[model samples]
Structures are given as structure tokens and as C-alpha cells.
Target: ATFISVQLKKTSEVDLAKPLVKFIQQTYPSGGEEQAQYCRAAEELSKLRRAAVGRPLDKHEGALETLLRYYDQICSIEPKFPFSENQICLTFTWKDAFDKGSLFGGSVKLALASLGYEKSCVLFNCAALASQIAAEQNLDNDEGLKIAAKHYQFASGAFLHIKETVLSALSREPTVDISPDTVGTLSLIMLAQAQEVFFLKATRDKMKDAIIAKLANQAADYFGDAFKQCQYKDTLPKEVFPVLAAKHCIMQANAEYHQSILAKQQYYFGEEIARLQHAAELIKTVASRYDEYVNVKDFSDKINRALAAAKKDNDFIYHDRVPDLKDLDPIGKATLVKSTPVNVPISQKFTDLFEKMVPVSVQQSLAAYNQRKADLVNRSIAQMREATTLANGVLASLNLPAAIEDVSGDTVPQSILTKSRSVIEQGGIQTVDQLIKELPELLQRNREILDESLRLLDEEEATDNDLRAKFKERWQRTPSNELYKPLRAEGTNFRTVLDKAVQADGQVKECYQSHRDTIVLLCKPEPELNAAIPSANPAKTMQGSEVVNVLKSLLSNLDEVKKEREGLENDLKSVNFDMTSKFLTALAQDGVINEEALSVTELDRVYGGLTTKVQESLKKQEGLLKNIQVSHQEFSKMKQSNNEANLREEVLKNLATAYDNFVELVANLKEGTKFYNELTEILVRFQNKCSDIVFAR
Candidate 1:
């Protein structure tokens, strides 16, 4: 039992299931059953890990694949989000594999605070469990030999993989069993055992002595390296290194004795006799010490019978001088085994559990595509913005709406009519005013939370001072000043966020007050708006007055251009840019993707026509606007100013501006509320952290 499986780290099943499920449900659309499925998957991962580290590691591909899927799941998410271990609560605990049992009777169990260490522990257990299974198999059967050889070689490669990559993930030195030199020793030991399995298979098949001899020679060489590794690592138990040394000796015995048969066939009696004598020397050497482990006593009896017959034959035949073992030709080799390269999905059943999550390439591809689309969309949007601004400014300076929108038909003017309906439908000004007022309470709640945590630290200091005063220096605990030093830094960081948000709230209120009268006036009913700011309908020219008709038509054209521009901007926003499949094939064909070039190509495929129309929309507004000014030339010259015309300007021109400002304030207010509420949760978390120290201590 020198090769007993690595003792596992004790762990409480962390609550990764809940947060991971919640995050995914929020991430994308689901059928409402995804939570249960995801929670079940996490539960399955836990149990599968539990399953692998226990008795009877039978039908292990199921357990192994489950572990791989979970490992793969962590890999999937880590790229998308940083510190995913904390976000998903990955508090993995593992014990020192080589440490002696503590007073509590278990080795030192350190709680590793990272997904990286969690993954390393998982991989280590997989190799340990599978290597244990390889040892468990009865090597007498042909099927058993294959199982043992395949798993042993796989474990060898896996241990080597762990040796190289598992170091950097850990902040401190790993357990002795998982340290590079020790893991390397384990790898070579397993590799030599794999070779031993193949040698047994070749011998069972009655294969040529030269082939078996070569396999045994390689097996012994590997064990020789493993023994040298053990010499330095020294963490391998006393029973373990002795067994390794014994394997190295027997393998050399197997090589020399089997190699003698090959020399006998070549009709070289002296050389065959020389090889047989050395083979006996090897069995005799190990028989005195390692015989209990390798059972070299029985093997020594077999080598003696062979050596006696070889001597008799050498004496009777072919007048050949009995040469020393060194003078004889060394045995030729024919390798039949090597360590299997560890890769995944190693099992046929490895269904990556979180297949819905996009791979890193696809995530990068989507990022690049969004970047490219933003570039195109922003440029097109800017061009439209400039044209729209120029057009609005031109008419605003001329007071075009004031001149034309006069309630000439003796009803509410089209300008005031639309503004009234727009404000009413948008929850009027009440929503903006209410949300802005509510932010103070939200901010204060965060203020109180951070306030309480800072107060709690001071109170702890007071208690320590009270005890110190009472005991008169006899009460020697670590100073509260020292304890709160780092904790105060946390409080200071939270204060910065709180103060910055307060300033933003102050700015919001200042802007709201500056525009209050205008917003209140715009939110009024039509009658109240008319009562507050009287209007005029004084286009008393003939019904077919060409000037009046031209002005009306020009305003209508402006509205149409403005409406179309809004739709085009939204089109730019809502473009379907699923770059997953596009980048996947590019990646599939060419090992690496040129993200920019690939994104640009696919951008044309999806957003090309949209981009064309966006540009076209901006271009048409430029041309259509020219005729507006051309017609307005005569309209302006013939236009007569009066009190009625000037009154229309107040109701239409300035009120329209107020409504746009009101809508912006509403958006900023809502965002502020959201920010404050989100900040409260983090502050509460901060308070919770302080409470754990104060109350729990």
C-alpha cells in the first residue's frame, strides 16, 4: 500500500450553486427551469468529486467527466469575469498531502481562496484516483493489463501536467505530494509501472525475449529516475521508496535474464552465460533486502536454475571464453510503452455542462465586432447629429415654428398639442421630480451603513481601552489601533465612493432647480398652458396664400426628417451582431483570428446595408433642408411681426426645449437612484464584514 491514494482536502460544499445560477439567469434568456438545472449541475459536480476520492473507484469515466465539465465551466467563466471565485463563492479547502497527522488527527487543511487552487486540487485528485484504480486492477487478465497500462500512463502525464502548471496558481508552496519534484517523482513511478504492465503483457503473449527485454530495460530506467527523485523529495514514505527501489531491481533482472535468451538464439554461449550470471547477481542482491516487497526469493530460484543450465551448455559447446559481464554485448531494446499525453475530454461521456457559455475566442470576437459596429454607428450618428443640429439652429434663429404655428385653424396649435401629449405619456414631470427627491433617502441609507461600520470600529477600540484601564496593563491583547489599521483603509475607500455620489446628487438637484419653472410649465394641461402663455392665430391671408402653404409644408418635411433620423439611430443601436458563429469558423479554419479584419468582414455581412441607409438618411436631410431655406426667403420678407406672433414663440419655441430637458433629467435621476441603491448593498456588505469581526470576536 506504499502507493496509497493522495489524502484529499476536507471541504464544505460551497454555495457556488446559488450565485452562479442567479448570474446565468440574469445573463441570458432561460426557460425558468435553468436555475434548478444549474443548481443540480453544481450538486452533481460536488458529489462526483466526493465519489472519486473514496472506496471502489469503479465506472470512473462518469466521475472524471463530471469533474472535467466543472473545471471547464470555471475556465469558461474566469475569462468573462475576474475574481469569479469570490463572486461564485469558491472557498475550497484542501489538506497537506504529505504532512503528518495533527493533534486533531488530520493533516493541515488550508482553505485556498482561489478558483486556481480549486482547479489544481481537482486535477490532482483525478490523477490520484485514476492511478489508484490502475493499481487496483488484477493484472492477470488481458483486459486488466490494458486498463492498468492505459490509466497508469494517463496518470503519469497528468502528474507531470500538474507539476508544471499548478505552481504559479498557488501563492504559497503547495503540499509536498503536489510540489513539482514530488509530482515528477510520482509521474516517473507511474510511467515505470505502465511499462511494467506492457512487459507483463508481452511476456504473457510469449513475445520474443528481445521485445520483453527492451520493455523491462526502459521500465527499470524510469524507476531509477523515480528513486533519485525520491532521494531529494524524501516525502515519499519509507515503504514507498523501498518499493520503488525493489521495482528498479526486478526490472533490471527481467531485462538481463530475458536478454540472455536472445543471445542464446544468436549462438553466443559465452555472452548468454555472462548475461545470465549478472541477472542472478541482480535477483540475489535484491533478495537479501527488498525480497519481502518484490518477492525476489522465488525469482532468485528461477534465475539460479537458468544460470546453472547456461553454465553447463557454455562448458560443453563452442570453445568460447567465459567473458566478464562488462565485456559482453549489451542488450538491444524495443520500446512498447510510453506515458499517454494528458488531454481532455478524456472520457467519452464528457459533456461540458455549461455549453451555453461562449468560449474565449467567441467572447473576443463579439467584443471586436461591437467595437467595429460602434465605430461605424458613432460616425454615422455624428453626421446625422450635425445635420439635425444645423437645421434646428437655422429654424430656431428665424423663429420658424413661432411664425407658422399660430392655431390658424383656431384649435390648439400642432406644436403645443404634440408637446402636451408627449409630457403626459412620459409620466409627466412628477416622475422626474419624485425620483430626484427619493435619492436623498437612498444616499442616507448608505451613509448610515458606512457610519455604523466606522462607529463599530471605534466602539471596539473603546472596549479595548476600558479593559486596559481596568486591568492596568495586565490585559495584554493585540492593540485595537493595530487591528483597525487595515480595516480603516476599507472605511476610507467606501467614504470616497459615498462623497463622490453625494456630489453627483447635489449637481442633479442644482440642474433641476434651475429648470424647474420651465419643466412645470411644460407639464401643464393645454388649457393651463394657454392660460399661462397666450397664443395667436393671425395668418389672416387667403386660404391659398402660397407663403403660408409653403411654410406649413416645410415644417411637415422637417418633422418627417427628424422622425426618420430617430428610427435610423435606433436601427444602428439594434443591429443583430451575433459574431459567435462567424468567429468560430474563422477560428476553425485558421488557427488564429485577425479580430479586426474578421469583425469588419462580418460587420459588412450584418450591418452593411444598415450602415448604408444610416449614411443615406444623413445625406437626404442635407439636400431637403436647402429647399426649406430657399422657400423661407420670401416667407420671411412677406412675414409681418405682431404681439400675437411674438406670443406664439413663448408657447412653442421655449416650451419644446423644456420638455427635452425634462426627459433627460428623468433619465439621470433614475440612474442616480439605481447607483445609490447598488451602493447601499456594497456598504451593507462592508458593514457585515465589520460586524463579523466585532461580534464574532
Candidate 2:
């Protein structure tokens, strides 16, 4: 109780209410101590309320109402408490407290009727309280600003909710027991507070002009509404007029400043200048009204600077002379003028001259150039075809059986063949230039494949050696002489498989190296032919024909070799698949042998001890079975009532007449008892009765 008095003296009434409400909740658990504490606090609050009577109520009145509600709840829980003696009187006291403090007698009811009104009011109060605390703490740094902005944003939402709730309530009840003007004025004030906080938040965030413009417009709307509501109200607050008017001007100025920027970006030079000028004038007006306000003066100065910048931009776009185009070629002139953005406004004279002087012939010339370029591209493609044919022929010559014998008595590697053909066919080498550019890369790729194949062969040999050593070690450790024979056989099989893979890889490497050498030879220049030509000719008809013929013959030969290589690859794949399958089957059989050996060793140990263990388990199981039999005998001795059976029989007897009538009705038909018996039988079964009942009836 002493602490309660101290808290009431030190803290705001709203703050006191919150802690006391929590204290009342705590009293429910601690019987004597907490109850006394709550009683002392409630009496203290009653004295404060009495002293505040006949005076204007502040926002704390709502908090006070909440405190009374808590007291009422406590009295309800402990009906024997002193405060619970006059529940009706206390209820009337609470209503009277709200009524006098409330702007309208029934306006609070209207607010309560609107959804989320209480939620908004609570949110607003919380944010306002937090902001006050933040200011008192002198938190002006980035972290503090962020915290303040968050609270302001919450307050903004609360204000919007209040605005919507009031508007909706008015529409539904136009003549509610509250003044419309008063409601409107209160709503506008809430909007004004919301908008001010929103603008502060936006400014602190350094938001973009477009977003700032949107926020300023919202604030401007709130201020405009406030001005309208307070315009003619003499008895109403007069101080709100100048404040609303100043905020309205500032908002309009802010909105117009950003609008000018947007207009400039969109190339509306005239509109940009007009918006800048209007924004400057509005800021000047605000400065005139609030001359002592430093921000107003700063805003006006900033707007004037922006207005000047906008004017300069306008001059650059409209007043500046168009660049001279007479000296430029037709294409250059067209590019220079046509590339000017269509959104930009140009002088009418310049536009007309550009349209007139820019010739249609420029487009015609470009079209003709494209046609010539296409013809040249086609010619180049034909030359590439001839070159490709020659390359193919050279590749085929290297792949023949005689050539394989010449190289190392083996075929080319399938990987090399696949890669080479893929490069030539899908390499986007349509033009002769592309073929020349990509040939070196193709040859280099073939060399890499050969080198990689050799590397893999060496790695495979090392792996096989390690595998054989591991198998030999495992064989030496085999305890049984019977296991040795199978282990030895598996080791030999594995060695043979490794040797075959190595031998095949060696052949592939030899063939790929030979093919790589053949490509190198084809890529080389013909020195003797060059000397025979002596001097270079732009139109070497005879020489060109000879080159074409040779290329065509080579491409034809290469295509044949590619087809044969594909067949060989398929045959190799099939052989490899079969070999791999046989190898896996052998490994699986070896695994099964090892598993059987392990199982045999385990079985010996299991057999040595299993008989005694089973005998002991059997004795225990026999004892359990005897106990179960005794339990069953005891259960069988208990008698069960036949009430369910008797009830079932009664139900069947009750339906007997219905079954008999149905059968008789069916028997009267021409089908006799065929249909009648079927219907009655189905009904009896559906009702879970005995089917024989129908026939019996």
C-alpha cells in the first residue's frame, strides 16, 4: 500500500493504471497480501479520480476507464470484498467518468460500434507513449530514429483505422446522438497526427520522390479536410487553423516538387517548369505564414533552387538550337535525328525539316546492301560445304581397316569418332570462315581425347594391381582348404577381366593418336601447289575448281567412314554390355560363397549353446501357459446376462407382421412368391434380422 502511494505520485495516471491492473491479477493467487495491495491501490485511484473531477480529461481518461474495468472484474471474482458491496453504483460511476470526458455522450458508443476502434485507440496511445519515452532518452541516432519511425508507422495505421471507422459509422447512422461537425473535427485531427508522423517517417527513410509525393498527398488531403471542418466554427479551437493551413501548404509544395521531377524524367518540359514554379510559390506562402519556422524558410529556398534548375532544363530542351545536319551523310543524318527520343519535344521547324530532308533512298540503299551481303554469305556457305567434304574424306581414309593395320592394327577410339563428328556437324560452322576458325579446336580436342585415354589406361592398371593384391591377401587368410580353391578361381577371373579392359584401352589410344596425326596432315598447306600458282589471283577460276573438287571428294570419303565408325561403336557397346553382365554375375557368386562361410562358422557356435537355452525357455513358457489356462477357467466360470439377446428377439418379433404382409402382397402377384420372398428377405437382412424370419412369417 505504501508502494502504491509512491507509484501514484511518481508515475503518470495511465502508467499507474497499467501496473495496478497487473497487481490486481497477481492478487488472485496470493490471498491476503495481494488483496490488500490491490485494495490500497484501488482506493488511491479513487481519490485521484475524485480530485480530477470538474476538470478537463486528457488521453489518460481512457486508461483510467480500463483500470475501473479491472476493479469491476476483481469485485465480480470476490463478491464479499468491500468494493463489491455496490456493484450497480460502481458501474454508474465508471460510465459517468467516461461520459463527461467523452466529446459526445453517445459518440463513444458510435466509436465502439465501428470495428477496430478500440484497437486503434490503444495502438495510438502505445505509440505516443513510446515516442515520448524515446525523446526523453535523447535517442536521436540512427537506431533511435528507426525505433521512432516504427512507432509512428503503427500510429499511422491507427489513425487510418479511426478515419475509416468514423466515416463508416456516420454513413450507417447519420443522426446518431453526436454532432457530425464534432465527429468530423475529431477525425480530421486524428488524420492530421497520422499524416505528420507518416511524413516524418518517409523523410527519415530518405524515400524516393515518387513515394514521398504519395505520402505528402495523403497528408495534404488530411489538412484540407481539417481546414474545411474548422473553417467556420467560432466556438471550436482557433489555433488549429494556422497549423492546418501551414501543413497544407508544405504538403502541396512537397508533392509538387516531386511531381516536377517526375515530369522532367518523362520529358514533359513545359509541365515540369509549371510544377516547379507552383511548388516554389506554395512554399513561399508557407514561409510568409510561418516566418519564424526555420524549416519553412529552408523548404522555400530549396523549392526556388529546384525551380531554377527546371527552368534551365526547359531552356536546354526548347530554346536551344537544333544541331546542323547539312554536312552529314544521309545515313549519319538519319541516325542522328531519328535516334532522338520521340518523347522529347523538338522545335516544329526542326521536326518538319528532319522529316523532309531525310531521304527514302537511304532505306533502299540499306536493303540493297543486305541483299549483297546475303549473296556473299551463300557463296561462303558453298565453299564451306566443299571444305567439309574434303575434311571428311581425309578422316575416312584414316579409319579404314588397312589404315588401322598401318597405325597399330586396331580401330579408332569410339569417343574420338563421336566427338569429331559432333564438332563438324553441330558446330555452327555454316560459313567457310567458321570452318577455318573451328578446325584447330576440333583437332586439339581429338588430341586431348587420345591423351586422356592413355592416362586412364595407366590408372586402370594401378587399380587392378591393388585389387589383385587385396584378393591374394584375403585368399592367404582363408582358414578352410575348401575356401582356397574358390577364392583362387575368383582372383584369376578378376585378373583376366582387368587385362582385357587394359588391352582394349591400349588399342583405342593407338587408333585415336593415328587419327589425330591424319587431321594434322589435312590441315597443312599445299606448298608445291602454292609455288605452281606463282602469283595470287583474285579470280582464280582453274585453281578454285580444282580446290572444290578435292574438298568434295574428301567430304564424301569422310561421310562413309563416319557411318562405318557408328556401326563399329554399336558392336563394341553390345560386347561391353555382355562382358559387364558376366563379370557382375561372377562377383555376386563370390559374395554368396563368402556369406555361406560366415554363416557356417556362426552356426557352429549357435549349435553349441542353443539346446540348453531352448530347454530353459521352454520351462518358463510351460509355466506361463498353465497360468493362462487357469485364467481362462476363471473367465469361463463367470456368467453373462442375456439381455441383448432378449432385446434382439423382441425387435424381430415386432417386425414379424410387417414381413408377413410384404410376402403375402408379393405372392398375390402373377410371379407368386418369387418376387415377394426376395423383397422380404432383403428387408430382413438390411435390418440385421435373421433372413429365415421372412419365410417363417
Candidate 3:
């Protein structure tokens, strides 16, 4: 079969389809010669003869035979041509219908009339030619009607042409890269109108529905194509991902449209879930804070009752309560409770109402937020699915099915390939797990940098004394040339002296008497005092009572001795003392010292000699004082330690149990990481396989 070709440049006045119409019309036979050939060849001669005897017949027998043969060949090849050659010949070719203003013959005329097209007489006798084809071919029913073979071919071509026209127009419109401009919207409208036209021409309702469904399917596919190109990374252009994302959203909306009948049901279900969730959250909040709410109510009631009671009792006057409100000091309990009468404010009720309304109002807002979140999430999921599907679909469209299988998985079903690419693009395929797995090496490199920095800092600090020497050298370098100068200039060792002084302030002290008391208290409590009294004590029920009293006495004496010892310690620290000479002199002067230093007689004698006998005793007095404070602290610690031991046994037991539970929780978390790792590996594998498959294809 020969094919007609049409061509155009960038500029043209006539519509691009006009040439195709002209070609289809010129192929049809004209006037007066056509019917004679058809009438002479009728299958049922008697039936045709009854109507044909008086009619004017056509004489273009050769053209009529060629036309008849052409119609027979076109219809016979398809066989759904329940229509006769005459009927098929009468159908409107694009050229005959539009330019020549002629339909095929009687059958084509009747079919066109059914479609609501009227014939114009000035366009001339082409309809007569169509009627002869109908008579010759025994065209009997609506399906039997035929147009010129050229017109029917053109009609099919027109459908295909219109589809290409729409797709081309859509291609030019702003899409994934460009925004949805006015042109895009207009193109979509045109596509939709084209679909409606086909819907009427469709031979069966199911086929019509399928075509319409496909139109929508094509729209989603277009959106998906736009979305697929939107995978912009941080390294890519900022607008790339966002534009693609918008296109994906459009595709998602179309997917939702595919299931439009179910939307209300889903929305209602979602709203109910939101309501219940909000209600439960409100109840939990109220229950948790119930005590605080009740307390406010109770506080109001208590104040009200208190005011009422005071009013009821006439004796409860201001003078009876206190000297004066000014003189009556508000401290402790009085400060906590207000003296003013309680009056519930209107604002309080309004505040309560506001709090109560928050749950429902927030629920509505949350519901809407959740709806968008769901839509966004769905779109995201659909985009991912769509991406994969498109990746696969593009392969399939190119007849490369193996690439889809290799990328998706061996077990992946072919049905999945047919799903909207946008769904796959936006789905779980591009999960959080996938994202996390992709950047492991990058994160690991960053971690190494941090560790290296820390290690270098530590190594530098450990081997170096430069920083420490700077602090010490400043002390020894100070000058002491002028007496009236600053402390640093007082002497070469002035800074050193200052450093010693600061260090002395923190030194531990020793006190002999305080130490003795501390040791005794730790060993046993003091003997019961006020034994003749009949309180809750033996003779006076004083086991617990006397224990506390003895402790307090020891603490007071410890404080005094501690202060004395610390003062002496500080004095000793102020000067660089001659330890060797001091020890020799102290031993010689106290030749009759007791063997055990704690012996009362020996300690008393030592103290007297140190304080009274030595000529420079004042120089050492501070040292003796510090000794007393040090001794006191040690005994105090001993006593405290003993008491703490008893209480800590129970506390430590509870702490041990808590530590065990904490260990268990940590173990559980560690175990959970395994699942996380498995999921991550799967996602990484998927993305890698997909990338490889896509590139390979």
C-alpha cells in the first residue's frame, strides 16, 4: 500500500492537517458514473432493481470498480468491517468531510447524519457516488456503511495524528525543567478535548473508557517523567530537585484522581483517627496534671470556707487576730496563704474554657497538617516508585526487559513495571535507610578527622612542660628592689611567696584534742546526761537523745580546734621554716616526752613547752594551731564514715538493681541496631543495583 506524506516548515497559514484532508478527498470517485457499476453488480438483484430502476446512474465504471476494489481490500483485511464495500466507501475521509463537503454514499451519509453532520448541496454529488458504492457493496446496516478507503485510513490516521499533536504540544509546554506556564495548562486542556472527541468515536463503551483512562495515564506518565529528572543533590543546581518535586506532586494528585471515588472514605477514616488520637492525648495530659488542676480548685474552696468561717465567728476580728495587719509579720505559713477573700474571676472561667477548646481546635489543625503530611509522604513514596518504574518503563518501551529485572530484582513481577513511574519514584524505594547508607564513607572520613585532631592535642600536652614552667617562672622572676613597690617588686621571691600563701590556704590541718573527741565519738556515744529526768530515756530514756547531744558537743569543740589549727597551719606555710633544726630543738627541750603522744600527761607537757618555754614559740604557734584543726577533721570524717556505712548498705542495694536494668536497656538498643543495619544494607544494595542497571541500559 502507498503512504501519503505531509510536511511543514516553522511558519504556515493553513493548518498542518489540511493537506492530509485534501489527499483523502481527491482519491474518491465523482458523480454520475458510479451507481451504474454498483447497481449492475448487486448480490440481491430483485431488491436493488425495485429501488434502482427509476434512479439516475453514474457512468464512471472504471473509477467505480477501482473504488469498489479499494473498499473491499480495506474492509476485507480487517473483517470487523461488518460493513459492505459500498457502506465502507461512503464513510467520510478527512478531505471529503471537511473540504469537499461530501460523505461516502447512502451508508456514509446515514452514519454521518447519525453523528450530526449535515450535507451541503453546493459541494455537489459525492454523496451520490457514496450511495452507489453502498448499493453495489450491499451496504445494509449502520456498521456496513463505508467511506472512501482513503477517508477511513485518514480517520484512523487522524486519531493517531491527534494523539501525536497532543503529545507534541505537551512536550513543548513547561514541564519538569520549566514551570507549569499558561501554555502547559492550555495544552493539557486541548489534550483533554481530544480525548473527549475520541470517546464518542469509540466503537464500544469499554474501548472508549480505556482510551480515556489511558489519556489520564499518559498525564501521570508525563508528570512522572518530569519528576524523574528532579533528583538534584547538594552538588547539583538548587532549583533542579524542587522543580522535579513539584512535577511529582502533580503526578501524585493525578494518581489520587485515578482513585477519586475512594477519597471521601479515606478522608473520613483519617479524620476519625485524628480525633481519637487527639482525644487520647488530651486525656493523658489532663490526667497527668490533675493534681495541679484540683489544687487550684481546692485552694479556691479553702479560701472561701476560711472567709466564711471568719465571718460566722464574730470573735474573729482584726484586733483579736493580731496587734495590726502592719505589725503582724507575714512569714512562713502566713506568707503562703493570702488573707484576702477569694473571688472567682470571670477571666479564670474563660481561661478554663480556652484550655478545654485547645484539644478540639488543635485536633482539626493537626488533622489538616496530617493530611498534607500524608499527601507529601505519599507523593514522596510515589515519586520513588515512579522513578524506578520509569527507569524500568523506559527500558521496556525500548524493548529492554532484562534491564528492569536486573535492577529491581529477580523475583520482581512484570505487573510492577506497568505501575505509574511516579508511584515507584515516591515510594519506600528511596527510604531513609538508603540515604543513610549512601554516605557512610563520608561520615567515616569526618570521624577520622575529629579523632586525629584530638590525638594530636593530647600528644602535644603530655610531652610538654612549657605551659607549666611559664606559671612558675613568673613567680621567681619578680623583683624585690623597692619596699614601697608592688608585691611582685618587694623581693626576688615575692611571687614565690604569694604562690606559697595561696597554697597554704588549702592545706589540711591537725588538732590533737579534736582528734581525741572524734575517735571517742566514732567508738561510742557519750554517757547519758540528766539521768534523774523521766523523759524517753533509761533513768531518762536518753539513748537516742544523749547520742545527738554528745555529737553536737563534739562538733562544736571540733570547729574551735579546727579554726586554731588552720590558723597555725597558714602561719607556718607563710615562711620557709627550718624543719631539721626545729625538730632537734623540740626534742631536746621536751626530753621527758611520753612514748605514746596521745597520753594526756605527755600532750599537756608538750603543749606547755611549745607555748611557754621556747623563746621563739610565737614563730611556731601557727603550726601547732594547724595540727589541732587537722586532727579534728580526721576524727570527724571517721565518725561520719561509720554513720554513712549503715545507711549506704540499703541505698547501694537499690542502686545495684537500677544499674542492672540500665545495662539491660543498653543491650536491647544494641540488638536493635542489627535490624537497622540489615535494612540499611538492603536499601544500599537496591540503589547500587538500580544505578548500575540504569547506566548499563
Best by lDDT: 1
Q: Once model 3 is optimally superposed onto the true structure by TM-score, how far is the C-alpha of residue 695 displaced, in angstroms?
A: 18
Summarize candidate 2's per-residue lDDT along 458-549 as a digit string, tens digits: 44445545654778564343233232353335335534644553454345345433433333322223442122222211222323344334
RMSD, one per candidate, in order = 8.7, 43.9, 49.9
Kindly indicate the candidate among 1 and 3 with the higher lDDT: 1
lDDT of each: 0.71, 0.40, 0.29
Instruction: Please provide TM-scores, in order, for all candidate models, with all chains considered together.
Output: 0.63, 0.30, 0.14
The clash count of every prediction, one per candidate, is 1, 7, 67
Residue 59's lDDT within candidate 1 is: 42
If the candidates were sorted by their lDDT against the true structure, best first, what order would they fall in?
1, 2, 3
Q: Which structure is stronger by lDDT: 2 or 3?
A: 2
Which residue pairs collide in model 1, if any? 9-95
Tens digit per residue, CA lDDT, model 3, 1-697: 0111111001112222232223223332444544333323322222322222213334344433332332232222221211122333322211121122122332111222110111111011222243233233322333432332222222222223222333233212211111222113222322222222232233233343223333434444443443443333111223333333333333223222222223223433332222223323333433344433212333233334433443344244322321222332111110011111112220111121111111222233334444443453344334333333333333223222221122211222232223213223332223322333433433344334334433443344443445446565544522222221322232224335334533432231122222222122212211221121112111222233443344334434532443354344333234232223333344447642222332234323433333232223333434443543454344333233344333332332222232222222233333434444554454354335434433432
lDDT of 1 by residue, 303-405 (tens): 8888888887767766677778768666565556666765656555556665655555566567767767788888888888677767776665565565666
- Candidate 1 overall Cα lDDT vs. reference? 0.71
RMSD of 2: 43.9
